[PDB]
From a paper:
Here we report the discovery of a natural protein, citrate synthase from the cyanobacterium Synechococcus elongatus, which self-assembles into Sierpiński triangles. Bacterial citrate synthase (CS) proteins are homo-oligomeric enzymes that can assemble into dimers and hexamers. CS catalyses the condensation of acetyl-CoA and oxaloacetate to citrate as the first step in the tricarboxylic acid cycle. Using cryo-electron microscopy, we reveal how the fractal assembles from a hexameric building block.
An interaction between the residue E6 from one monomer and H369 of the other establishes an important contact, and mutating either E6 or H369 to alanine or deleting amino acids 2–6 (Δ2–6 SeCS) abolishes the formation of fractals. To understand how this interface forms, we compared the geometry of a variant that could only assemble into hexamers (Δ2–6 SeCS) to that of a hexamer within the 18mer. We extracted a hexamer from the 18mer structure, aligned its free corner dimer onto one dimer of Δ2–6 SeCS and then compared the positions of the two unaligned dimers between the structures. This analysis revealed that the two dimers engaging in fractal connections undergo a small clockwise rotation relative to their conformation within a free hexamer, which subtly breaks the D3 symmetry of the hexameric building block within the fractal. Comparing this structure to the one of a free hexamer (Δ2–6 SeCS) revealed that the CS dimers within the hexamer undergo an anticlockwise rotation after binding to citrate. This rigid-body rotation is well known from other CS enzymes. It takes place following substrate binding and pushes CS from an open conformation (which corresponds to the conformation in the Δ2–6 SeCS structure) into a closed form in which catalysis takes place.
Author numbering:
A (entry chain D), B (entry chain C), C (entry chain E), D (entry chain B), E (entry chain A): 11 to 111, 118 to 245, 257 to 307, 310 to 379
The structure:
Amino acid sequence: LEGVPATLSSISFVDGQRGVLEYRGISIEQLAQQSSFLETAYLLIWGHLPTQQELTEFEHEIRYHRRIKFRIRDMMKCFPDSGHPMDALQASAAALGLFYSPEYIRAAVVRLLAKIPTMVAAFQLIRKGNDPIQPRDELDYAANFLYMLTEREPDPVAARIFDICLTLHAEHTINASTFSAMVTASTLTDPYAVVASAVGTLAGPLHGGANEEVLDMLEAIGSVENVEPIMGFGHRVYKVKDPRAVILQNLAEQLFDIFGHDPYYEIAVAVEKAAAERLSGIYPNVDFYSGLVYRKLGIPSDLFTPVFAIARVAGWLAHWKEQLNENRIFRPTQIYTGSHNLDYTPIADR
Amino acid sequence: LEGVPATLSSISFVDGQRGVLEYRGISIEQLAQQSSFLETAYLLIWGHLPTQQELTEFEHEIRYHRRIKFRIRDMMKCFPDSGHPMDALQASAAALGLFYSPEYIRAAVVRLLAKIPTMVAAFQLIRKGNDPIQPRDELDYAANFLYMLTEREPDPVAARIFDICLTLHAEHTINASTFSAMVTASTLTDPYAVVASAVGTLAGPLHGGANEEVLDMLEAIGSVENVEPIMGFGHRVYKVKDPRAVILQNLAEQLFDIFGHDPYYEIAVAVEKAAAERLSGIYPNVDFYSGLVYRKLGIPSDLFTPVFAIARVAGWLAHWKEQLNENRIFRPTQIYTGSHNLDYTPIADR
Amino acid sequence: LEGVPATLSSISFVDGQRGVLEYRGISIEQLAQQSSFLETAYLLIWGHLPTQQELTEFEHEIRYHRRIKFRIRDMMKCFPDSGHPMDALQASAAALGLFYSPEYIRAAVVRLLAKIPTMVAAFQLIRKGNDPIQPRDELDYAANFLYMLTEREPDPVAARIFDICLTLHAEHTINASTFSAMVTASTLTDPYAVVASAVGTLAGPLHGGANEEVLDMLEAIGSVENVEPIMGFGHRVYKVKDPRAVILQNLAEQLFDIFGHDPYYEIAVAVEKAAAERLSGIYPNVDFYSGLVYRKLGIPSDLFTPVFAIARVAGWLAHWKEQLNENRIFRPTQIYTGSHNLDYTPIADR
Amino acid sequence: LEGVPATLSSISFVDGQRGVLEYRGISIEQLAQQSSFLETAYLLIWGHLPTQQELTEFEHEIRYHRRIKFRIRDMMKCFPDSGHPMDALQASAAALGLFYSPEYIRAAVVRLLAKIPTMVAAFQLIRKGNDPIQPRDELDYAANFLYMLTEREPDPVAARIFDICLTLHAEHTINASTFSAMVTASTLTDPYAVVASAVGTLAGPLHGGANEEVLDMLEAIGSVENVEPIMGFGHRVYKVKDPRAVILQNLAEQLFDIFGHDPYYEIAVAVEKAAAERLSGIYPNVDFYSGLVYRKLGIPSDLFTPVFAIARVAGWLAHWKEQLNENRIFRPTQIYTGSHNLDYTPIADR
Amino acid sequence: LEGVPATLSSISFVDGQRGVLEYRGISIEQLAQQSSFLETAYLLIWGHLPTQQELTEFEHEIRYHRRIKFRIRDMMKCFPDSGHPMDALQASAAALGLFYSPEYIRAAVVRLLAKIPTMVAAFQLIRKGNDPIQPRDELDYAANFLYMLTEREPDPVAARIFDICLTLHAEHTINASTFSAMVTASTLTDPYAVVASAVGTLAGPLHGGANEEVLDMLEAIGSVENVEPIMGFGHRVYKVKDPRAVILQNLAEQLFDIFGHDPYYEIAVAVEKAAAERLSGIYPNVDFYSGLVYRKLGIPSDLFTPVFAIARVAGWLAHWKEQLNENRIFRPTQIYTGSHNLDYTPIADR
């Protein structure tokens, strides 16, 4: 289906031959320097920058809905401990519609945005046999998520780095997950089912992406002298450089300089400086620095993809709201490549 | 059975032709101005005003027993979400006897008084899918109940208004609920069964009283210009004015002036000033101002009757303790108005 | 309140100076010989003998509703194991209104009649740590209750004896429990609250009656030679003989002759033959033979009163239905025997 | 402690230089041919062969107590799915004392014997996410255990083989588990604690014995042509042949001839016929044939040791009952091989 | 088995003819004056006094693991309320192996030491129907245990007295419980099974020791004038005086002088001053003062033995670690005192 202009969207723009990525016409650097995750999500979903009162009301509503019912936690207590976090995320997103399914757009958006990280952290805590940690009203989005994940209040620098990372991964362009979200939404269904379908599509093979395989190769190297004696490089769109990659690398460098270097960072630098001298087109992408940034913040490996989903919910929701107005069922045609006009044969004659 | 002096009680006195209401000989105005709910309950149950040490010990014992066992909360978790609060209150009062049934009078009184509002608030929170809020030892009776109901610490003015309202509704006179309580207590049964029977009697039709129908009429009017273009007025005892009504109206006026006016207050004033000019005998009663006072404090509509029950437990308990000493089973006689000396007819012959 | 004709009822007639007991004008002997419990309950509630089709439909509806929801069983699983069966019965009757509260009279009657013994047996099984036994559609009322209580299908003779015992204890006359039921029902409340109030009244002191104290005296005697070297005799109404007592004694004699004599029966005969020679007025009542009949059927001691309640639900319900049509709140008057016109005294001045 | 005659027991006799094993003086062949597991357990515990009435009463009491409370099953539902069956067995044996701890000896024996296999099968079913299967009164000990384990009623031949295997493994002689059982019982403690201590001792390294390593070697060989191109042979007591081994081999041969040969049996025969020609002293023991017999009956590998424990409970209990009469705390002496008369040193000086 | 030097241990030394008790060669007075419980446990298990960094790391690791999983608390919620604390302790110790069974020695030691008092307090709270109190990171071992037991933060003096008491009862010498622990550990099993076996052995008769019978006699006397008008005196090892008894008496005197005298202390002094004048050899032991010290701290009577177990876990663990290196199964020999060479008799011929 590649190459078919099946959608008319004014949400994001991507130029691979120039390294340009824009959210609603605003470059990603502007949002990565002078914007947060919630304001970027408001810009994506509603199409315009919120005012002061709108931003404060949005943040208050999101902070008020960060707590989940005790029935949802009880449901998570019945999840098997060996299940993957993506399956649990899909199950919880589908279960949100058992409870919460003009003002319908705004309420659903704020509930989903407030509650998705809460359930992710709750399942992370429950899987190891611990009790889920309740959200705190004093903290903000990224800081509260980090506290819920690690039981400890994070440094403001780490919270800012995580917020900018979420903004970078908020949305890129049309893809399999977004296409599935729009296909589900074309039937005028509740956004919780759309989110569940998008998460199921995003799970992919092995319930993970190329964010952990980079760490696997890095551990396989195991030293800064085995890099010289491939996943984590290249891209299918951009040809000069991924514009998110430079910001991610700068954030990783700043966070590691402030919080002290680690050996895996050293092996990453050793491999990347060698790869930039013999393969450069081939350039590193966000899949290389995202793993390092997430691991330095204390995020487990198998929770890399769910965190990505936490960033992507704002994108999906945006594409949902658009689709709505353009109500049109995805009903493509097919060509038959089989046999014709044969008859049923008795079972005894087979 | 109306008109039969079936009880000899020295607890309360009511004079409808003079507008007099007295608790143990003390006028309701004195208690509404210079007394709290717990001291009034002590006066009602024990017949005399407590001293300083007695009052402090009573308050300490009540504050210590405000917490319910986790089995009771687990039982509430199994209650259907569509059940009425009165049925849940009766079930919880009956379940208290599964656990806690000279020193027997005092322990039962303090446990019931401490725990009834706790279970009311716990069911209110559980019904909506939230976790019950634990009581705080720093707050007092009314303030702790309001915090448990609304998750937020109330203003001291609101707590005082609620305490005076509870004192006003603590006890009025013999009625159906009190008669049922005395009938149950005449068999020398535990006070928890008496409280459950009294709550079941108090539930009445539609599991509610005339406190919500006033709000229904007020919403039906919907404006301050539709009052001119009936429940909430009149009484069956008093002919001049309900002495509790004037205090309730003063409290409502003070609370609304301090906390800002509301449109429903405006419609209430518009309807009452018109009704006092063409119907005055017909006068407003406590059922008119109680709904407004409770709604301004954040109390839901369907929890009006349970809150009334919270006020009435002190009265019932008092009537229980009295009845005890006067041990006499309510064994009235009957007259037969049916057929006599007929025989059984075979089923095939019917 | 004794001696006041407060009720006009055509349900039952009692003549103590002639030993006459009639249900709706039909003598108790006719119903005890040629009637069952369900047909007698239909006669009591509806006032006339049911036809064939009506009786079959009533039995089918009762048999269909004998199964309780899993939420009720879960609630019983949270009951403390040391609680008394009467408190659990009251709690379950109150909880039935959380779920099931022209056709309203009939549905409530059949649900209560079908489900009360089911919950009694379920609590009996749960209290000892066993799982409740589900009802069987092949058995009838008494046989199914006995199977649920003892896990074993009873002999048809035992089932018939239990059915006749239930018919005998179905209703006697106005008393404390029935008066409380009518007082609760006068407010036009649901029958589940009426049943809960009646059970609470019937619990009485020590959560039991004089049915177990007879066994206590019999065990204290401990032999057929210690009767010569009082609870279980006399009555407050009848002067010649209790007409239910002769039928109960005949049933006990028949059941014990068919199923073999027991030592406690021998001590009962020894004490009764001595008491009938020196005290005869003083005559044995149903409280003497009911304990023996229930114990021979395998019913535990502390479940004597609940079984009585199972018999009495038909009576209460009947009195409920009558009361309804005669809607009149029990609002008696009182006389004040206390002090007048005293004032509040400061706490520091006490 | 080897070589010290610390116990005087008349329960079992073992002669390794003659291949003699006797239970209370009766050879193991007599019991393996003309006795069952329950009668052998009665002989071991009570010292004499039961009569007809005693045997029937023992079997009836054991069959009546085969059902466990729902609280125990609920406790098993909280066990982690990754836990080993031996830890769960120890936990359940310890939990039995939370409930059931002249007639005390007999009741404890029958409860333990009836309930241990029930909990083993219940944990086996729960661990895989299935519901436990309730026991059937129609089946006997071994057949009911096999039905509970595999949901299917076993062939009578298989049940007989399993019963004879249980009789063979009922008891051998004093060892670590029996010594721990007697040490625990010397303090006059309940038999449930003794059973829990014995199970904990029997768990050993890796929570298993040499019964699964034989299957590991057999699978490693993987063919009947790789035996020629060691666990499962030899013993520390017998020098001619294990008298239980010949019976176990005969039972395995009969069961496999009746139920059809399997490839692992073929590899077992190939390895044993080669080992009996070049190593014969070195002879196979019960650890070789027990695994094959258990696997052919459908018993999982990791449940080999618990089944052994099911056989051994009769032995332990016997040694418990004996110990009782000979009340003497195991209080051995020790010799000090450390430093003397040194003093405490400040932490800052270390 | 008394008198057999079955063990070679350099952990503790006891001299009864001189009143000497040493942990690893260091006298008990030095540790009771200038040491805590955790440092003494480190000395016992590892054989040398920890340094500053080692002590801080040990305390940090113990404080981090003081919290138990929610599955363990759920398992305790299923324990019967009438069960004894020792059975619950054994069940919880066995259940710890369902979850947590070079670095293996240290992790197991810290988990057991951190979690045993937590589960003891959790069962104490659950048994009465209250929720378990979570540990606080600000408090230390004894203070946190006292807070968890009594919901109130203890005075530092009381915490110090409790810590010294735990140090005194940490370990005495080889006995039945330690012998059972070594017998279980000789099979190279996990330390959780060893702890469960040791607890089962320590439960003893009536699930308690002679620490509560002293209080029983003291209450039987009931006055300071009935001592003149035996458990709690004497010992089986020491002949001059128990060296722990003098420290325990000094601690009790100091704690009671600081916190005010109690009548039971007065009766204890009256009985001990009379017993020291007519029986002195006969001297009081730790069983006399331990009950008083524990009761003054708010510890219930039936939890005396579990608290002792909390002290003894360090000893058992030490003996476990030693045993390990000296791997040798306790396989004693026996002498047969029964019949020989008899045959099986048909059941019909018995």
